[PDB]
Design a protein around this ligand. Structure first.
Ligand SMILES: O=C(N[C@H](CO)[C@H](O)c1ccc([N+](=O)[O-])cc1)C(Cl)Cl
Length: 391
C-alpha cells in the first residue's frame, strides 16, 4: 500500500486545496446573484472575499504546532469536515451579514492546507518527491483563479448560487475519504505539551527579523492588486462598466494567462537565474503594468482594456518574481519553517484583508482611477521593501 497508492494523499490534498480556492474564485462572480437575492448593496461583494481570507489567517498560527502534538491526521480531516459543514450551512444564511460570517467560518479551512496538510507532505515525502508535489499544488493554485470566474459566471445563468457550495462540499467530501484512507500520521511531537506563551514567544522572535518582515510584507503588497481585482472584478466590470458576464469572463483570460505565462517562464529560467535576479526581472513588468493601468484610468476612467492590459503585464511580473521572494523570505529566518510559514501567511492575509476593503472604498468613491492608483502604491511599497530586502 506504500509505494504507488500513497500518492492518493497528495492527490486528495491537492483536490481539497482546489475546492477551497474555487471556494473563493467561483463565488466572486456569483456574489452578484447572492447580493441581489439578499437585496444587499454591491459593497458586500468584495467583502465576501475579505471575510474568507480573514478566516484563513485566524487559526493559522495555531494549527501547525497543534497538529504536531495531537497528530496531523485528526486535524486535517477535521478541517475538511469543517469546510463541508460550513459550505452547506451558508444556504441557511438568510442575511448578507450572516452570509459573510459563514464566509469567514469557511475561510478557516484554508489554514489546514499549509500548516498541517503540507507539513505532512514535507514529513512524509523525500525532498525530491516533495518538489513535484509542491509544483502540482502551485499549478492547481494557478488554475483556480483562471477557471473559477469563468465557470462561476456561467453557473449563475444555469443553477442557483447555493449549488456552488454544494459543489465545493462534494469535492471536499471526495478528498476526505481519500485522505482518510491515504494520509499517514507524521506528527513527531505527540504527546508533548503545547505552550501558548512559548508559541507566542516564537512569533515575536520572527517578527524581530528585519529582512523577513520586509519580504513577507512585500509579498502581501505586491499580490494585493491581483486579489483586489479578483474581489472587485464583478462590480467593476458588470455593475460599473455595464458589461456582461461574457466580457467579465473574457477579461480574466489575459490577466491570469499572463500570471501562468510568468510562472512558466520562471520554471524555464530557474536553473540559469537566481531568485534575486528574478525579482528584479519581474519588477519591470510589475511597475510598468501598474503604472499603465493607473495612468490610463486617471486620463479616461472608462477604459477597462488599458486597465486589463496593465493588470496583465503586472500579473506576468508577479508570476516571475513571487515564487522567488517566497523562498528568500523563508530563508531569511533560521527559525522553524512552520512558524516562519504561518507568520508570512498571516502577514500577507492582513494586507489582503485590509487592502481589499481599502480598495473597495477607493473604487466606490473614485471609480477605476482610484482602484488603479491604490494598486500602484502597493507596487511601490513592494519596490521600496525590495531595495531594503536586498541588500
Ligand atoms: O488567495 C486565495 N485565492 C485567490 C483568489 O481567490 C486565488 O486562488 C489565487 C491563487 C493563486 C494566486 N497566485 O499564484 O498569485 C493568486 C490568486 C486564497 Cl483561497 Cl489562499
Amino acid at each position: 500500500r506504500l509505494g504507488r497508492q500513497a500518492l492518493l494523499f497528495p492527490l486528495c490534498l491537492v483536490l481539497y486545496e482546489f475546492s477551497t480556492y474555487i471556494g473563493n474564485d467561483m463565488i466572486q462572480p456569483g456574489m452578484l446573484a447572492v447580493v441581489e437575492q439578499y437585496q444587499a448593496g454591491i459593497d458586500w461583494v468584495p467583502t465576501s472575499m475579505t471575510a474568507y481570507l480573514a478566516g484563513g489567517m485566524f487559526l493559522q498560527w495555531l494549527l501547525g504546532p497543534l497538529s504536531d502534538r495531537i497528530g496531523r491526521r485528526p486535524v486535517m480531516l477535521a478541517g475538511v469536515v469543517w469546510f463541508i459543514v460550513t459550505c452547506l450551512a451558508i444556504l441557511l444564511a438568510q442575511n448578507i451579514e450572516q452570509f459573510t460570517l459563514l464566509r469567514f467560518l469557511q475561510g478557516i479551512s484554508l489554514c489546514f492546507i499549509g500548516a498541517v496538510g503540507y507539513a505532512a507532505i514535507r514529513e512524509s515525502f523525500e525532498e525530491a518527491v516533495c518538489i513535484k508535489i509542491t509544483a502540482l499544488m502551485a499549478n492547481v493554485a494557478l488554475i483556480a483563479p483562471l477557471l473559477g470566474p469563468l465557470v462561476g459566471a456561467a453557473w449563475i445563468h444555469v443553477l442557483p448560487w447555493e449549488g456552488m457550495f454544494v459543489l465545493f462540499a462534494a469535492l471536499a467530501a471526495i478528498s476526505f475519504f481519500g485522505l482518510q484512507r491515504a494520509m499517514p500520521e507524521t506528527a513527531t511531537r505527540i504527546g508533548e505539551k503545547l505552550s501558548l506563551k512559548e508559541l507566542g514567544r516564537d512569533y515575536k522572535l520572527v517578527l524581530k527579523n528585519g529582512r523577513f518582515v520586509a519580504g513577507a510584507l512585500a509579498l502581501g503588497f505586491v499580490s494585493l492588486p491581483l486579489l483586489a481585482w479578483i474581489a472587485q472584478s464583478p462590480i467593476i466590470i458588470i455593475t460599473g462598466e455595464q458589461l456582461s458576464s461574457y466580457e467579465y469572463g473574457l477579461l480574466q483570460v489575459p490577466i491570469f494567462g499572463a500570471l501562468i505565462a510568468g510562472n512558466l517562464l520562471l520554471a524555464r529560467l530557474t536553473s540559469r537565474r537566481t531568485v534575486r535576479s528574478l525579482i528584479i526581472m519581474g519588477g519591470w513588468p510589475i511597475m510598468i503594468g501598474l503604472l499603465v493601468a493607473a495612468a490610463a484610468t486617471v486620463i479616461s476612467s472608462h477604459a477597462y482594456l488599458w486597465m486589463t492590459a496593465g493588470l496583465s503585464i503586472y500579473a506576468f511580473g508577479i508570476g516571475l518574481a513571487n515564487a522567488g521572494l517566497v523562498r528568500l523570505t523563508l530563508f531569511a529566518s533560521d527559525m522553524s519553517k512552520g512558524t516562519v510559514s504561518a507568520a508570512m501567511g498571516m502577514l500577507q492575509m492582513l494586507i489582503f484583508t485590509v487592502g481589499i476593503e481599502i480598495s473597495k472604498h477607493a473604487w466606490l468613491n473614485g471609480g477605476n482611477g482610484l482602484f488603479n492608483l491604490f494598486n500602484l502604491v502597493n507596487g511601490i511599497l513592494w519596490l521600496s521593501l525590495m531595495v531594503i530586502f536586498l541588500k
